[PDB]
């Protein structure tokens, strides 16, 4: 009668990086919602964390969450490439002068 | 034992009415 799964139950919501992330959304695109994280950045962070890209955010385990955290805050120690991370008024006045003196000619 | 489960649950944790008019500006 007593069955407990060691992985833990699916999590509808999670709190990552002071941000609420829906478990339903895919891990890569569920991670994009955090500010400063785009699709490519989330993809690379997932690859570094060794988290399968067929997983939902709710199914992630605690150690995977901690690993992706550590990847985000401390990018360089994991060797992420660095690349991956009045005049107009004067011209207007000149044009206006030109127009007024154009009227003068005409 | 409590301190161990404090860490785990961290990830787990996450109208106009009546005659009210729309705001002026």
């Amino acid at each position: 009668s007593l069955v407990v799964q060691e992985q833990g139950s699916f999590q509808h919501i999670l709190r990552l990086l002071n941000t609420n992330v829906d478990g339903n959304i895919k891990i890569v695109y569920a991670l994009t919602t955090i500010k400063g994280v785009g699709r490519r950045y989330s993809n690379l962070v997932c690859k570094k964390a060794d988290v399968d890209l067929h997983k939902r955010a709710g199914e992630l385990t605690q150690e995977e969450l901690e690993r992706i955290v550590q990847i985000m805050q401390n990018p360089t120690h994991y060797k992420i490439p660095a690349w991956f991370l009045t005049l107009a008024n004067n011209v207007e006045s000149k044009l206006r002068d030109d127009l007024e003196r154009l009227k003068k000619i005409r | 034992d409590k301190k161990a489960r404090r860490r785990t649950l961290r990830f787990y944790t996450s109208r106009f009415k009546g005659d009210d008019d729309i705001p002026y500006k």
Binding site: - | K17, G18, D19, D20, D21, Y24
Partner: protein
């Protein structure tokens, strides 16, 4: 017949439009409005939120234009937020435009009465109770109060008596304007009701209960 406050025997549905925000200010004296006169009301210290008279205009139009009023079974009372109590002759046809409505109230407040050549609008002395029928039931509109079918309510009430409905013209406020005078408080709809909508419901219910049609 056109009912009058002097007559108390006749059964009638009284509606008291409490907390009516009708006030005249002269820079010439004109009716205050929440948006037209904002800085002027700020100089008084009265918040512009509760300077909203067309709700009273809206309630009067639906109340006066209701069939029950045409049947001579309804009188309207307005208790101004300032403390001024106003009689509404059931025969009056107030102007449909608000700008013309405002010109009536300024005339009414200053002249104390409106006559046509019976005063259609006339100021009266407080308290309300002397003007109300001798035998009468009093209720208010409260959202927290229990949802009751107005048709069901009127049917179980006695015939010779009369019913007062205290509707708060105020956009927002604590529903205690008529607590001193009223004996019970009743809710009409589960959902919020505007003052114009709520009084229209009572007019619809009284028509069905009394078969005014």
């Amino acid at each position: 017949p056109v009912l009058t406050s002097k007559d108390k025997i006749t059964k009638r549905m009284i509606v008291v439009l409490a907390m009516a925000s009708l006030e005249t200010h002269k820079i010439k004296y004109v009716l205050l409005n929440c948006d037209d006169h904002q800085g002027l009301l700020k100089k008084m210290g009265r918040d512009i939120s509760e300077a909203r008279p067309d709700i009273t205009h809206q309630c009067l139009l639906t109340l006066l234009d209701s069939p029950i009023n045409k049947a001579g079974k309804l009188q309207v009372y307005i208790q101004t937020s300032r403390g001024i109590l106003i009689e509404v002759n059931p025969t009056v046809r107030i102007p449909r435009t608000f700008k013309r409505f405002s010109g009536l109230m300024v005339q009414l407040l200053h002249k104390l009465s409106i006559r046509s050549v019976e005063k259609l609008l006339k100021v009266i002395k407080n308290p309300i109770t002397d003007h109300l029928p001798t035998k009468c039931r009093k209720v208010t509109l409260s959202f927290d109060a229990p949802v009751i079918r107005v048709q069901d309510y009127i049917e179980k009430l006695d015939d010779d008596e009369s019913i007062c409905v205290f509707v708060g013209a105020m956009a927002r406020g604590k529903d205690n304007f008529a607590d001193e005078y009223v004996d019970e408080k009743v809710g009409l709809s589960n959902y919020p009701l505007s003052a114009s909508v709520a009084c229209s419901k009572f007019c619809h219910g009284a028509e069905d209960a009394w078969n005014i049609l």
